[PDB]
């Protein structure tokens, strides 16, 4: 019966909330009150990568930390060499409405997707010296929002149909589908050990998924609007959510509860991108207000602003060695900060 099911569901929700509260001993700030503040941090635009026509939605660094791929709404996928600004590749796109891009850890393929509902994989290394579509992945009902390569033959994609899927490039089939989100899924981030991933949707909630099994391990709430960005902590036991209510929050899988809030009275626009540093002590976040703010992830006090974009900062990433920060924006410009 539906009524008794709802009653037991709400009572178990109450008991899980009570257990979550009981597991809370002290706040993050109380323990991290004696830590020495990182202080003001200044970042200068070392390189400005020019060549994109329309606004830029996504970028991704390679494992080599030298090469990176950026996607623009002009239907061009350009692979840069941030050391020398030289454009290594420039891949035309079948659909000019790309919303995400990825760089394989091996560096052999790149992926992109968007309003076409399809994740396209391009082979970067060919004997003829030209890049062509290695495989077209179809099956998602809604627009693609994110996609990350688990390996050379696996990729997890998040779409606007409130679902996440695990694919197989060799066969082009959905190995596992992750269901349970209520609204459009906006971002995801693979764990450092490539065993779990977290997804932030528009239902103001984030869920933890396991690729091997394929069910929602944990559910996290606390945001009051659409979650636009999400990323894992370097240690892999925490993640940060950047949502549209102009706040960022930290969640710990072990504690299964919200940890810290990164918000300010002056900022009223939502978060577009979220990423940590090499050590995790520094949390960078993009903003709708044309600027990128730098947060100290332990104290929740701002420590810098990456101003320099005359339009919306739609994406940002930190190299694997943590030696650079690239922030694409709606002005069709990428900027390397160091």
């Amino acid at each position: 019966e539906l009524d008794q099911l709802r009653q037991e569901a709400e009572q178990l929700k109450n008991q899980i909330r009570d257990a979550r509260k009981a597991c809370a001993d002290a706040t993050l700030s109380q323990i991290t009150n004696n830590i020495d503040p990182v202080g003001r941090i200044q970042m200068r635009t070392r390189r400005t990568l020019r060549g994109h026509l329309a606004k830029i939605y996504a970028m991704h660094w390679g494992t080599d930390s030298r090469l990176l791929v950026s996607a623009s709404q002009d239907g061009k996928l350009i692979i840069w060499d941030s050391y020398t600004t030289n454009k290594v590749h420039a891949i035309p796109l079948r659909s000019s409405w790309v919303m995400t891009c990825a760089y394989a850890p091996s560096g052999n393929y790149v992926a992109c997707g968007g309003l076409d509902n399809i994740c396209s994989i391009y082979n970067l290394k060919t004997r003829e010296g030209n890049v062509r579509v290695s495989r077209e992945l179809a099956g998602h009902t809604g627009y693609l929002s994110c996609c990350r390569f688990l390996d050379d033959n696996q990729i997890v994609t998040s779409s606007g149909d409130t679902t996440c899927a695990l694919w197989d490039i060799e066969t082009g089939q959905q190995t596992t589908t992750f269901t349970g989100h209520t609204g459009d899924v906006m971002s995801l981030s693979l764990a450092p050990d490539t065993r779990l991933f977290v997804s932030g949707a528009c239902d103001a909630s984030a869920k933890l998924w396991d690729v091997r099994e394929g069910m929602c391990r944990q559910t996290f709430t606390g945001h009051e609007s659409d979650i636009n960005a999400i990323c894992f902590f370097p240690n892999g036991n925490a993640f940060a959510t950047g949502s549209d209510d102009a706040t960022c929050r930290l969640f710990d899988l072990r504690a299964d509860q919200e940890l810290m809030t990164y918000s300010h009275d002056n900022i009223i626009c939502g978060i577009t991108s979220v990423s940590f540093s090499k050590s995790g002590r520094l949390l960078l976040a993009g903003y709708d207000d044309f600027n990128c703010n730098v947060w100290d992830a332990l104290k929740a006090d701002r420590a810098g602003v990456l101003a320099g974009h005359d339009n919306r900062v739609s994406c940002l990433g930190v190299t694997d060695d943590g030696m650079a920060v690239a922030t694409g924006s709606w002005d069709s410009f990428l900027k390397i900060w160091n």
């Binding site: 060549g51 026509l53 329309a54 606004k55 709404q73 002009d74 061009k76 350009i78 060499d81 020398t84 600004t85 030289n86 454009k87 290594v88 590749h89 420039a90 035309p92 659909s95 409405w97 919303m99 968007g114 309003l115 076409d116 509902n117 809604g142 627009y143 606007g160 459009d184 906006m186 528009c202 659409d226 709606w330």
Partner: protein, 211 residues
């Protein structure tokens, strides 16, 4: 530098010249967001994405139909938005009004002009002449409305007045709405071309400090 550095530089320069050729070829096109509603004749207005290409007066237009609160951010730099409503029926006309309100007051589309096509005017004329369905049942302010067959003009001008009254409640001249009456008609491409030319002229006036 070294020989391989020169090879990388020449590869980059060929890529850059191809990119500039592509930009010169593809930034002369005007992107249009066909964003009407179902049963409104939106698809057959010009003789998960449905892009259509048409050319008028040696100018390339690119219309995009999607088949909403999140992917609408992608159409931030479109030249204009084409909105198509079904003026024949009145039960869903308030829904069209609400959709136009939400589109006009959208934060991402606060600088994008909207071309409004009041489609299916022949059915509107047939319905208003029949008399079985009265607009006052759905819009009681129509009974007290007087125009500035006469009743056909009264009804169509009343609907257009409602839409433009919604349009002018906000914006402060940053973007305006162009209302058109559409049947079957084969002149909609010229209307879109003229409206986009006016929009671009206004943009040039604003960017050249002339207004």
């Amino acid at each position: 530098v070294s020989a391989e550095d020169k090879a990388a530089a020449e590869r980059s320069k060929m890529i850059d010249k191809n990119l500039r050729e592509d930009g010169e070829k593809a930034r002369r096109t005007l992107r249009l967001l066909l964003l009407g509603a179902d049963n409104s004749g939106k698809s057959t207005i010009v003789k998960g994405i449905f892009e259509t290409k048409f050319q008028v007066d040696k100018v390339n237009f690119h219309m995009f139909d999607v088949g909403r609160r999140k992917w609408i951010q992608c159409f931030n730099d479109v030249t204009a938005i084409i909105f198509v409503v079904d003026s024949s029926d009145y039960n869903r006309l308030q829904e069209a009004l609400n959709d136009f309100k939400s589109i006009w007051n959208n934060r991402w589309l606060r600088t994008i002009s909207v071309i409004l096509f009041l489609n299916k005017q022949d059915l509107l004329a047939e319905k208003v002449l029949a008399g079985k369905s009265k607009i006052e049942d759905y819009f009681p302010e129509f009974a007290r409305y007087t125009t500035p067959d006469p009743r056909v003009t009264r009804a169509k001008y009343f609907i257009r007045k409602e839409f433009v009254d919604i349009s002018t409640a906000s914006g402060d001249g940053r973007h305006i709405c162009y209302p058109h009456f559409t049947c079957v008609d084969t002149e909609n491409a010229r209307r879109i071309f003229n409206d986009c030319k006016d929009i671009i002229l206004q943009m040039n006036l604003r960017e050249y400090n002339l207004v």
